Design a protein around this ligand. Structure first.
Ligand code: K
Ligand code: MG
Ligand code: MG
Length: 217
RNA sequence: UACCUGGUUGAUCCUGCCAGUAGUCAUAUGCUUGUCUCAAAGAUUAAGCCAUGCAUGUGUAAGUAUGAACAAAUUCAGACUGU
């Protein structure tokens, strides 16, 4: 079936780690998509966003390969992006799905004004940049909806954000750069230091130290 | 009610524009047009030229009646006292 090759995979298969937040807290790399499948796999949905052909000139013609972009998300604060180039479209799509699962990230959602109910928009103004494409996300009031182009709108819907305003600059027709900039903007949500995070951190044992005895075999 | 997409390359990222998408109590034109309620309408070029018809007249007890205007009365007198 599945034979984990990493300590994190072994712990996830042994059920010692039960939530993705435990991994996110210590920022441990995730190198097996089976971890994501076991943890948040049931609630994950994938979508192919673009099949982009690329060509390399050769002495006997052009070698064509296809680029697959895949967006995965749970619609509840977890989203991931994957890009895979391969000779076959099916292989490219499979690799892109695996990469998106591996690259899933947590997304912070806040409130525009009054803080009643679950979060509906980004906690603060954020900006992501990939190549020449810059995507800016601004909080919006409840009921404003997702004001964004189709690609960022799909990314935000998979991330689970209810309402937001967006602005874009640069060559947004470059779909890869557009989606990557949106992903970077979403990732930057948890990197902003707000007053509510001013409390001193109370550290906890990392998984590798907590279950060191189990992993010692 | 804070949104983009196609087009320079063998392929890539850009600048950059062209094209597309939507709107006008915005004009005109093409085709089509069964019912109800609303409703603009010779401004844009020529404040260019105009046949014909109409669009400014007016009376209360209280300015002026002798129509040779009508009507009722007067057998005798009457300036006039209804229109
Ligand atoms: K008018
Ligand atoms: Mg604007
Ligand atoms: Mg060509």
């Amino acid at each position: 079936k599945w034979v984990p090759v990493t300590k994190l995979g072994r712990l996830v298969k042994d059920n010692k780690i039960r939530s993705l937040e435990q991994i996110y807290l210590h920022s441990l790399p995730i190198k097996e998509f089976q971890i994501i499948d076991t943890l948040i796999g049931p609630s994950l949905k994938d979508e192919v966003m673009k099949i982009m052909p690329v060509q390399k000139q050769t002495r006997a013609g052009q070698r064509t390969r296809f680029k697959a972009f895949v967006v995965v998300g749970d619609g509840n604060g977890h989203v991931g992006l994957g890009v895979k180039c391969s000779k076959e479209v099916a292989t490219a799509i499979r690799g892109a799905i695996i990469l998106a699962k591996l690259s899933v990230i947590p997304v912070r959602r806040g409130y525009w004004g009054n803080k009643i109910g679950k979060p509906h928009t980004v906690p603060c103004k954020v900006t992501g940049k990939c190549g020449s494409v810059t995507v800016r996300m601004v909080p919006a009031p409840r009921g404003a909806g997702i004001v964004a182009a189709r690609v960022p709108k799909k990314v935000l819907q998979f991330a689970g954000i209810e309402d937001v305003f967006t602005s874009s600059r640069g060559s947004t027709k470059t779909l890869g750069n557009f989606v990557k900039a949106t992903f970077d903007c979403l990732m930057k949500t948890y990197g902003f230091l707000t007053p509510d995070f001013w409390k001193e951190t109370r550290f906890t044992k990392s998984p590798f130290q907590e279950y060191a005895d189990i992993l010692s075999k």
